[PDB]
Amino acid sequence: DLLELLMDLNCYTLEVTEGYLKKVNVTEVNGLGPIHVITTVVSSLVRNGLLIQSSKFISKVLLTVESIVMSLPKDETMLGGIFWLSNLSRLPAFAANQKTLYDKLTLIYLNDLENETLKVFDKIYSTWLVKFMKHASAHIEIFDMVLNEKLFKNSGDEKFAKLFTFLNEFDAVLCKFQVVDSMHTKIFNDTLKYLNVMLFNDLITKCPALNWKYGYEVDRNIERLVSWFEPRIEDVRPNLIQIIQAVKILQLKISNLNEFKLLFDFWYALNPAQIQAILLKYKPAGVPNEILNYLANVIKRENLSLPGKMEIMLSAQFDSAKNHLR
């Protein structure tokens, strides 16, 4: 009755996708379920050579997990995002391990399953992380903690304590829901890549006047923020390269276009409009016109040569989980 069960493509994928997953209310303990159910069905189907059925079943299941995740409510986003992503994150290595036991069309199917499952993972992961980090940055008040010069006179201490608790709690859930080590560290790098974007964009849009002192104080707040990550991941600062360079620029004492050219010609961490944006905001407690002028020309030169907009704002972008799913 097995193959006849497996041919009812519709019966059982309806079971998993409406009966089991759309209704997997997390807030509940162990004994990795969805990856077990998904993976049992896929491996039965592959063994019995139903390769097309597997593809369809896996498609519906991914589309389903995707909308579950995308539909999660503001207070469920952390737990839910992590539970689902931790489960999906195992599909690529499952495909790689399936193939270790295999004819040649099956090997090709599984090869494809591995790349395609990885691509869907990368899609859901990125959109979840930005949505997750939008909410967490408001709640933890990253702006007022780091960039708000009005609150430099404050210890900062309560807010920092709240950031450290949040990250300890982010870190527990990651361990709770069993995310693999190499993805745990990636999540923390991307978390910082996200705060690079938000912090740099807010430095430009939200911070009225800037000077060397301002720059020095943000630098310290950043080093405070980064102190949590440090016993945890490889090297956290490259993730925060734009916002770190912007506030370092603010502390340079540059007095001729000749020093400036030495510092920024053929230096691409920030573009010319980003660097100009930062220096037009400079107010003592200023920039030589000669420097303001050369930037203008540089910008104009680049408008004339290339077809694409030279964006001042950043967007969050993360690497593929390709090498991080061990």
Swiss-Prot record:
It comes from the Eukaryota. Part of the mRNA localization machinery that restricts accumulation of certain proteins to the bud and in the daughter cell. Recruited to specific mRNAs including the ASH1 mRNA, coding for a repressor of the HO endonuclease, via its interaction with SHE3. Belongs to the TRAFAC class myosin-kinesin ATPase superfamily. Myosin family. Residues 59-301 form the Dilute domain. Interacts with SHE2 and SHE3. Present with 2210 molecules/cell in log phase SD medium. It is found in: Bud. The lineage of its organism: Eukaryota, Fungi, Dikarya, Ascomycota, Saccharomycotina. This is Myosin-4. The gene is MYO4. Disruption phenotype: Abnormal localization of ASH1 protein to daughter cell, with protein mislocalized to mother and daughter. Decreases HO mRNA level. It comes from Saccharomyces cerevisiae (strain ATCC 204508 / S288c) (Baker's yeast).
